[PDB]
Design a binder for this molecule. Structure first.
Ligand SMILES: Nc1ncnc2c1ncn2[C@@H]1O[C@H](CSCC[C@H](N)C(=O)O)[C@@H](O)[C@H]1O
Ligand SMILES: Nc1ncnc2c1ncn2[C@@H]1O[C@H](CSCC[C@H](N)C(=O)O)[C@@H](O)[C@H]1O
Ligand SMILES: Nc1ncnc2c1ncn2[C@@H]1O[C@H](CSCC[C@H](N)C(=O)O)[C@@H](O)[C@H]1O
Ligand SMILES: Nc1ncnc2c1ncn2[C@@H]1O[C@H](CSCC[C@H](N)C(=O)O)[C@@H](O)[C@H]1O
Ligand SMILES: Cc1cn([C@H]2C[C@H](O)[C@@H](CO)O2)c(=O)[nH]c1=O
Ligand SMILES: Cc1cn([C@H]2C[C@H](O)[C@@H](CO)O2)c(=O)[nH]c1=O
Ligand SMILES: Cc1cn([C@H]2C[C@H](O)[C@@H](CO)O2)c(=O)[nH]c1=O
Ligand SMILES: Cc1cn([C@H]2C[C@H](O)[C@@H](CO)O2)c(=O)[nH]c1=O
Lengths: 247, 247, 247, 247
């Protein structure tokens, strides 16, 4: 007889999601990036052994860093990410908190915020608040490492990417697109998945602010750190912003 | 900071669903329809006390009929519907089975299939199979009552309907549309719901066959029942098809 | 034979749309709101005869205001809205421009921005830029009227609304929901429409900033206007912010 | 300022579509399949020079066949396909008609229906009608070639496929899934496309009937053709059904 077909769609706000972050992570060199942090910190703070990673996602960078920085922690707003990070690490707490205003009641030799995550900040004032909150988790001589998002100058229009993962009984395809709006880059990601249970379609739209170099350096100085822009680490044409907390 | 937005959509086959059937049921006169069945059965079988309702949905017609037909049962393919019907009734079994070929190992004084449900049959042969399976659950003198779907002649193009249910902290709206394809009516139903958890969109597309009067009467005769078409019960311009099982 | 079913979905950025604004407008008292503007302007500027409406949408408020302010204009970023407004008005130009930084090369006795449209501004600095751009289209003694969006204090969580319009051969239903995120209200609107051509589903998600009273008054003062908050016009519990441009 | 995001979705019935058929066609060996037809026809009808391809899609098989069968035609129900086929061919008419009941007022040395297209027939009676309509476009000695869809025995559960086409400024990904329902295979195809205009999602669900070998052979015999099943041409484990029209 005739058999109906159906769909259900649910819509809402989104934060870090396990599989999404797994999936994005596939061609990503967590090792190289952890190395940037280790190197820039140890140059400025040779004995550094404690580290906080702010908006740490799945905790994968921490899994690299902890060999060098055995007294480590994470901060993640997404309950799902926080639980997945904590599962993956050993005796490394991951705290559920807002990068924009958090306080853990301790300091660390280094604080990092990686892969442009700081550009969830919507404006310069909010950027400054995040960098301040990071800086108060440092002692004098502590190192603050920001892997910035793109600037208005360096953001490239026209980006489109896809990926495919074909497993046993399950295939997932991904397509993504980005475009500029004012001083925001808007990122669209769509997934289709198919297995024995059926087909699913997932989508997410997220904005990141395009801050010029001056705004990052400024945020560092206002947070009581001596600001550097380093171009021999980080991604080409963006580099890293580093601050050493001043007495 | 910036907060992403997201959607997840899942696609699959659909059978009877609790809320959907609740919702459809709102202006529906279960009482009037149960009365058609009671009346047509008692005219032909004055002592009738047992009844089987095939594709019984939520079991609401059975809840009316059981006062008159205290030894009752249902058949429902949808596990969700079967469980909801059984919950609503007292000591009335609802069996998970296919109306097209089922066998319960007993007979009943009457068998019904209501609200056009028989027109899930895709063709005349399948219609005949359903009516046969119904007819073998009757003794000699048993009454088979079919509330047919529309025929090619009587189906009306242009149907569009909507409903709204506005509760405390939750609103659901529904919009539906139907159109003819060959000898099939295709029914589209969309829902939007919104509460504190967010917004959801649901959709379903289902076909029903448009059988002419002759095909229903034929199915009855081939199932060993004496066929009637009754026009003073059932919906205007379609009536009911009734069969009395013959020795 | 079997006939496939299908969907196509397109995703993108959205500005003012004709039918959407028609639809929203249905219970809206354009007359009352135009009256607020007329009254507050004529109290402060008895001879006022020219008016600019910034983010004017369909131009419906202008259609009321022009009897009183016969030398009028609009500003609208959405090409569709701009064309629809201009169609509806007589000899009233509607300019395609950004409310945040526009210059028409003239002044007007009054400038307004209605129904919370100013709260497309993402932060206080951007609010100040819009109000400045408005204020430079005023002479000394000119009146700037802002119908603000809600403040953090006055925004009400839990809003859900629906509408239905049932025409000949066409029905449109609408469902909307809003919630607070930080100092942003996020507004979701879904439509279903059905006619002889089929069924369509439309959705939009839009943010507005929740600015406290001080931020609006501040923006006025920094734009060289003497700031008032008026509570006997505008919506209950929000009022209007008015500025008189100072020499 | 804040910029809304939006989606529009339209739902309806679907027939052959140009890009979809392009896309499906990518790993398809039109040449091999045209060769099956040529070979089976010329074995039985050495002088054969005229051919009709029923449900011809884009006309690509015809573009191969016409070298051998220069007096050719197509039948296609989809206006879009019919126009695209006719564009691609030279002086080969493609008629808009229903494969289930059409009459072109001539015969051809051969009639084919390829890539399982005949299994749009919903039941045996409809299959027989299509094969009859094909057979009356043949003279005595004419060859009818059917590339059948899968049978209940040979249909394989678990099929999932994907494709990707990455062009300059445009990427399209495709994911498909099939499953069995009663004697129907249900096919779901989803596409995501992204270019400078945005992202689009397309989906289609289509049923094909699973007929056993006997039903195809039967249809041939009832259409006045001598039936063969050939296993050294066509796809492995399904072969071709061929009929020679009898005096
Ligand atoms: N306000 C906030 N505070 C803390 N974490 C946040 C946040 N807003 C977003 N995030 C998190 O930031 C992460 C960005 S995804 C990438 C995370 C990681 N640094 C990496 O390089 O792999 C998400 O996991 C999201 O949950
Ligand atoms: N093959 C099958 N066998 C049994 N029930 C079926 C079926 N195909 C569909 N149905 C059921 O038929 C019902 C149609 S909805 C209406 C049911 C009920 N007779 C009424 O009048 O209210 C659905 O609950 C669905 O689950
Ligand atoms: N940056 C910008 N500049 C000008 N208009 C804008 C804008 N951003 C959004 N808008 C417009 O602002 C309008 C908000 S809708 C309501 C408009 C109208 N004032 C009313 O009360 O009816 C939309 O038409 C949208 O196109
Ligand atoms: N009833 C009908 N009559 C004619 N064509 C039909 C039809 N139902 C579906 N079709 C067409 O059948 C085609 C199936 S797609 C494949 C077509 C082609 N034989 C090939 O091998 O490439 C579609 O183009 C669709 O438009
Ligand atoms: C290399 C590079 C990538 N990208 C961006 C565009 C995409 O949105 C994103 C893909 O990782 O990276 C730039 O914006 N600039 C660059 O120089
Ligand atoms: C009254 C009536 C309703 N309908 C149909 C059209 C819709 O698909 C459905 C709504 O219940 O009923 C007919 O087809 N014919 C009729 O005579
Ligand atoms: C009356 C009133 C409406 N609303 C809002 C909630 C909804 O998002 C919107 C509906 O017009 O108005 C407030 O936020 N506060 C109020 O006092
Ligand atoms: C080879 C083969 C493919 N397939 C089907 C499953 C998929 O729905 C479809 C992919 O072309 O082909 C079979 O059903 N049986 C077979 O033997």
């Amino acid at each position: 007889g005739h058999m109906a077909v159906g769909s259900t769609s649910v819509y809402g706000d989104a934060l870090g999601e396990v599989y999404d972050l797994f999936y994005r992570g596939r061609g990503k060199d967590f090792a190289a990036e952890a190395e940037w942090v280790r190197r820039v910190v140890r140059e400025r703070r040779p004995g550094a052994r404690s580290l906080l990673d702010v908006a740490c996602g799945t905790g994968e960078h921490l899994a690299h860093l902890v060999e060098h920085f055995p007294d480590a922690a994470g901060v993640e707003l997404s309950p799902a990410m926080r639980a997945a990070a904590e599962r993956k690490l050993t005796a490394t707490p991951v705290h559920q908190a807002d990068m924009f205003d958090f306080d853990l009641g301790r300091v660390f030799d280094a604080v990092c915020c990686l892969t442009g995550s700081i550009a969830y900040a919507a404006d310069t004032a909010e950027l400054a608040r995040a960098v301040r909150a990071m800086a108060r988790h440092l002692p004098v001589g502590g190192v603050l490492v920001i892997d910035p998002w793109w600037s208005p100058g360096t953001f490239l229009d026209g980006h489109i990417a896809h990926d495919v993962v074909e497993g046993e009984g399950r295939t997932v395809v991904r397509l993504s697109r980005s475009h500029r709006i004012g001083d925001v880059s808007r990122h669209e990601a769509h997934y289709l998945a198919a297995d024995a249970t059926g087909v699913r379609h997932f989508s997410q739209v997220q904005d990141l602010t395009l801050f010029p170099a001056e705004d990052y350096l400024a945020a560092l100085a206002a947070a009581g750190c001596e600001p550097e822009h380093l171009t021999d680490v980080g991604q080409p044409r963006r580099g890293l912003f580093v601050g050493v907390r001043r007495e």
